Amino acid sequence: MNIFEMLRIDEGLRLKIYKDTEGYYTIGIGHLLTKSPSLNAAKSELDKAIGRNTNGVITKDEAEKLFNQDVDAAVRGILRNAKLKPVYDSLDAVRRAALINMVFQMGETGVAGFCNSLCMLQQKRWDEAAVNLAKSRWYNQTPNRAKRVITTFRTGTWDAYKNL
Numbered sequence: 001m002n003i004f005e006m007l008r009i010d011e012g013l014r015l016k017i018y019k020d021t022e023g024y025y026t027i028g029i030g031h032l033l034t035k036s037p038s039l040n041a042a043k044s045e046l047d048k049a050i051g052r053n054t055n056g057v058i059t060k061d062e063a064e065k066l067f068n069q070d071v072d073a074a075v076r077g078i079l080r081n082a083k084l085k086p087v088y089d090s091l092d093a094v095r096r097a098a099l100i101n102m103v104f105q106m107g108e109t110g111v112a113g114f115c116n117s118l119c120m121l122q123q124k125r126w127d128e129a130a131v132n133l134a135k136s137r138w139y140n141q142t143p144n145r146a147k148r149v150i151t152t153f154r155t156g157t158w159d160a161y162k163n164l
């Protein structure tokens with residue numbers, strides 16, 4: 001297991017535009033296109049992202065290219081973020097993947113909204129952090145994914161992604 005495999009499990013793979021869990025047009029492995037309700041706006045964003053006129057359909061290779069860019073940008077963003085970098089740097093590689101997963105799903109600003117949990121993680125109070133992480137909109141709206149991510153933070157293992 002690694003961050004790519006983990007996010008592939010949590011995000012799926014779809015080659016046509018679809019709506020994510022929040023109703024927003026997305027493609028590939030969780031590549032958000034736009035929050036606009038306009039499908040034509042989403043199709044325009046897709047063509048810009050891929051560099052050709054796609055009409056809403058891409059190949060697996062193209063989905064994986066966007067995914068690699070998105071993972072890279074998430075990590076680089078964490079490192080540029082004065083709130084998230086110290087916590088990231090304090091963690092082992094498995095827990096780092098859980099943090100990247102959260103940032104991929106909700107963005108840097110959203111994860112910075114988890115400061116109470118982030119402090120507990122930085123202090124390596126793993127069970128306390130896990131309890132606090134679940135007191136969130138995130139957990140309520142995507143509980144199965146959140147439970148996997150939280151187990152990864154609690155244990156520092158890949159156990160939640162083993163049967164999957």
Ligand SMILES: *SCC1=C(CS*)C(C)(C)N(O)C1(C)C
Pocket residue numbers: 082083086087112114115116118119120122
């Ligand atoms: S998210 C709140 C913050 C933490 C965790 S306790 C810390 C890394 C120490 N950081 O400076 C804050 C104030 C942003």
Ligand SMILES: [Cl-]
Pocket residue numbers: 049
């Ligand atoms: Cl892009």
Ligand SMILES: [Cl-]
Pocket residue numbers: 015057058059060
């Ligand atoms: Cl296709």
Ligand SMILES: [Cl-]
Pocket residue numbers: 128131132135
């Ligand atoms: Cl708590």
Ligand SMILES: [Cl-]
Pocket residue numbers: 141142143144145146
């Ligand atoms: Cl879920």
Ligand SMILES: [K+]
Pocket residue numbers: 010011012020021026029030
């Ligand atoms: K998804």
Ligand SMILES: [K+]
Pocket residue numbers: 030031032104105
């Ligand atoms: K995403």
